[PDB]
Amino acid sequence: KIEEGKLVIWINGDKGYNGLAEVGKKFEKDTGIKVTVEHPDKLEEKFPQVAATGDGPDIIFWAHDRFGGYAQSGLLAEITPDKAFQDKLYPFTWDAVRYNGKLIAYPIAVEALSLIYNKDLLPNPPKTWEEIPALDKELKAKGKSALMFNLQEPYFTWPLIAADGGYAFKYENGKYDIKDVGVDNAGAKAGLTFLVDLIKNKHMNADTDYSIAEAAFNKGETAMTINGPWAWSNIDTSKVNYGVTVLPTFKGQPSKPFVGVLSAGINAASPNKELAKEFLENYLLTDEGLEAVNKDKPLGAVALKSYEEELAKDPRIAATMENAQKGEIMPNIPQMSAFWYAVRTAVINAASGRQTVDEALKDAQTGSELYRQSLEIISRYLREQATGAADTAPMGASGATSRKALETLRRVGDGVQRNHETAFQGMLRKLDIKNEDDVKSLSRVMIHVFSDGVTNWGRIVTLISFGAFVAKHLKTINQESCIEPLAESITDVLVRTKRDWLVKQRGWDGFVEFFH
Ligand SMILES: COc1ccccc1-c1nccc(COc2ccc3cc2C[C@H](C(=O)O)Oc2ncnc4sc(-c5ccc(F)cc5)c(c24)-c2ccc(c(Cl)c2C)CN(CCN2CCN(C)CC2)C3)n1
Numbered sequence: 001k002i003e004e005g006k007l008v009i010w011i012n013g014d015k016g017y018n019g020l021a022e023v024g025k026k027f028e029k030d031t032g033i034k035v036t037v038e039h040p041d042k043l044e045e046k047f048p049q050v051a052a053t054g055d056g057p058d059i060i061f062w063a064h065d066r067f068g069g070y071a072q073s074g075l076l077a078e079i080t081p082d083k084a085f086q087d088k089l090y091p092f093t094w095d096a097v098r099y100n101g102k103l104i105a106y107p108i109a110v111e112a113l114s115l116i117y118n119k120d121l122l123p124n125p126p127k128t129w130e131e132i133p134a135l136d137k138e139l140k141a142k143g144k145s146a147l148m149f150n151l152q153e154p155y156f157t158w159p160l161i162a163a164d165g166g167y168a169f170k171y172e173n174g175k176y177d178i179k180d181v182g183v184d185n186a187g188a189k190a191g192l193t194f195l196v197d198l199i200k201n202k203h204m205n206a207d208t209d210y211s212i213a214e215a216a217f218n219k220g221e222t223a224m225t226i227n228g229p230w231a232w233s234n235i236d237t238s239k240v241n242y243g244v245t246v247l248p249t250f251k252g253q254p255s256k257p258f259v260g261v262l263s264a265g266i267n268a269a270s271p272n273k274e275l276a277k278e279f280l281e282n283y284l285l286t287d288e289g290l291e292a293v294n295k296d297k298p299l300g301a302v303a304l305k306s307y308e309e310e311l312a313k314d315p316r317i318a319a320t321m322e323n324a325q326k327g328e329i330m331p332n333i334p335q336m337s338a339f340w341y342a343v344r345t346a347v348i349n350a351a352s353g354r355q356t357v358d359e360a361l362k363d364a365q366t367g368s369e370l371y372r373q374s375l376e377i378i379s380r381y382l383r384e385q386a387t388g389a390a391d392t393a394p395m396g397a398s399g400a401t402s403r404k405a406l407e408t409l410r411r412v413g414d415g416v417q418r419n420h421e422t423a424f425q426g427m428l429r430k431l432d433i434k435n436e437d438d439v440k441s442l443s444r445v446m447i448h449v450f451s452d453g454v455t456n457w458g459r460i461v462t463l464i465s466f467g468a469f470v471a472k473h474l475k476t477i478n479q480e481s482c483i484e485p486l487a488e489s490i491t492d493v494l495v496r497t498k499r500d501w502l503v504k505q506r507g508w509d510g511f512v513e514f515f516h
Pocket residue numbers: 412416420423424427431442445446449450453457458459460461462463466
């Protein structure tokens with residue numbers, strides 16, 4: 001499917017893709033291998049769709065947070081650089097691209113949002129978010145505004161949501177508690193309510209997106225913006241006398257931007273893996289390769305120690321690293337995609353008045369917890385049905401929901417299996433199962449049959465009950481190790497294809513209510 005003898009690269013439209021194409025031309029000069037750089041729209045959503053069919057680019061560039069989901073789906077080649085190459089990059093950047101103990105991408109650069117201000121309009125930028133309404137009123141008297149930034153991508157609003165205590169997945173004792181989501185706590189609510197109040201008081205407009213905020217800052221209409229290092233090139237061209245500084249505090253606490261490490265992963269379906277490794281290690285991740293990209297659109301604090309020693313002297317890079325140290329390195333867990341979609345919907349709905357801050361963040365919490373809660377219920381049902389004994393481990397966060405959904409699932413699911421016993425036994429024969437490969441083919445049939453019909457709790461219970469019927473067969477045929485991957489496969493198609501409907505039902509609470 002992917003053509004051998006060439007390299008196709010995907011990178012976001014806000015990065016230095018013309019600089020990257022200059023590195024590709026240098027590679028072609030030596031090897032005769034043509035390198036095509038593309039920047040398709042929504043490349044981070046297109047990549048898992050096309051790479052799953054054996055298609056897509058040879059190399060994908062994105063911040064490290066999406067890569068764990070790609071790796072979990074088997075879409076990325078494991079990268080194994082030698083120690084001499086590994087030592088040329090900062091160890092924390094390699095940590096950002098490690099998933100299940102394996103390196104799944106090459107780190108390129110460390111990105112963090114900073115406060116960018118027009119020194120000619122605002123010689124002393126604000127230290128707090130609280131003083132921005134009064135500053136906006138003062139600036140409005142002169143035909144200017146205090147601040148405009150992209151309100152359509154939650155990445156830009158997150159530093160404010162996290163400032164007073166909001167968090168994505170709790171991190172404590174050197175580990176993430178995936179069961180602990182903090183998008184709907186008092187801290188997140190205060191941050192988002194402050195943003196909504198800025199919009200209600202006409203200090204910001206809910207429709208402001210990336211282009212609008214960028215045009216207004218680069219034309220001197222707004223005194224401040226919130227953006228990353230890639231934006232500096234267009235501000236340079238505009239000749240605005242700008243500064244790059246620490247984000248304002250909220251309730252006396254620093255804004256905490258989610259820090260991304262721009263990384264390059266190699267498609268598992270690529271027949272050009274050795275060419276991609278040579279391109280990335282020996283052409284791109286060199287002082288000259290990174291300089292070519294950086295001159296087009298700044299990368300931020302690069303992962304390559306030798307080049308970073310020079311960039312670190314730039315006060316804009318010092319400000320980027322200061323904001324990064326006050327924030328957090330993004331997790332790379334597979335549910336980051338679901339978290340981002342949920343928080344993106346929450347900020348847009350709260351900003352537009354479609355939902356209150358409380359309704360918006362409650363839905364964001366349900367969406368962010370959906371995979372873990374669904375896995376807990378489905379995994380426990382399949383394993384207790386197969387072995388005849390329940391899991392003694394504590395249910396954890398939202399244990400009441402899990403326990404009640406499991407009790408409901410025992411009552412309804414058992415009835416489904418009892419009434420359709422002969423029909424399920426017949427289907428189990430056609431799907432000849434005796435090993436791990438036979439479970440993977442069953443999964444493919446499940447995904448299509450479930451995805452084809454109507455969305456309702458009856459069909460969801462059928463999908464899970466048939467999975468329990470199969471897990472019983474796996475226990476007797478001494479293939480009990482296939483049960484947990486089957487539970488993960490059922491959970492994945494359920495949370496991915498029925499995401500919106502699930503959240504509208506208040507997740508598993510709606511299931512308990514429906515069958516009450
Ligand atoms: C108010 O409703 C409820 C309330 C409480 C609780 C439940 C409900 C409620 N709701 C909605 C459907 C239901 C019963 O669903 C069954 C139950 C046995 C069957 C077919 C269905 C159809 C149903 C659907 O697509 O709607 O199936 C699924 N729904 C969701 N995910 C899924 S995944 C999935 C599946 C999984 C693995 C696989 F390799 C193939 C398919 C199926 C399914 C599915 C489809 C079809 C068949 C089976 Cl065994 C299954 C389990 C066979 N099929 C036909 C028999 N054949 C015999 C011979 N004859 C000559 C012709 C006829 C029997 N129960």
